[PDB]
């Protein structure tokens, strides 16, 4: 297809070149010749857009070197892009893009028009018009009815003047509106510490059930399991432990770690540890606690979780709970 491709180039040139150049070509060519060139262009194979640009730029360089002046080279490239058809892949891409925009706007169509009107009313009138231009007439009518009066008139006037709309711009507008609705829903909802709620439930469940649930959660998501277990025994739960349990904890925990942990601890938990030490060890502990001076909250928190890590091993070994 070497002579066929040269003929195909001729066909594309005929249709793409400026009319000053190609009017003379048409006059010299017979009707049979012109029709052979038209049939060649019509029967062209489809070519990816990036490859049509390289073909266009080759052709442009080739005819400039052939001795033909091209005043509007970018208009020549676009004309070649009209002649050479697009591929099935490119047709599918456009279809998929259109389908995604449709899916997004269907989700918008489900949303109460009072909510859409409320989210749209402080937007620029041209933005509201561009958005409403893509909705069903009854949706856009419902939204318009829930807008202020002078905005009803201005949005409809701007819709009236539209000659074009960029689909991707409106799609993006719609997705930001869906995220804003999702964000308002979170603000409308009661905040809930799910890891804590799950922890209480598990602590109420018997060990057989509790441990089998957690193990399965850990296999799929080991980070979530751990965040749940952190809530199952907290520093405040030291109150639940016996004096016997505290003695065993005092045998293992570092003094400095315990001192620091107790700086941000309630008074009854302080006394829970202090009452299980000796008179002199307790007295010296309180004295050294004042000796520390200003300690960061992040460090008090760290020492508290360290005591809890130690306490977990007691639950896994000695201390009943």
Short mmCIF file of N, CA and C in Angstrom, two decimals, residues 160 193 197 280:
data_model
loop_
_atom_site.label_atom_id
_atom_site.label_comp_id
_atom_site.label_asym_id
_atom_site.label_seq_id
_atom_site.Cartn_x
_atom_site.Cartn_y
_atom_site.Cartn_z
N UNK A 160 -30.95 31.00 28.78
CA UNK A 160 -31.41 31.43 27.45
C UNK A 160 -30.27 31.84 26.51
N UNK A 193 -17.69 7.70 68.65
CA UNK A 193 -16.39 7.05 68.68
C UNK A 193 -16.60 5.55 68.53
N UNK A 197 -17.30 2.34 71.15
CA UNK A 197 -18.59 1.62 71.19
C UNK A 197 -18.38 0.12 70.93
N UNK A 280 7.48 5.06 102.80
CA UNK A 280 8.66 5.80 102.32
C UNK A 280 8.74 5.89 100.79
#
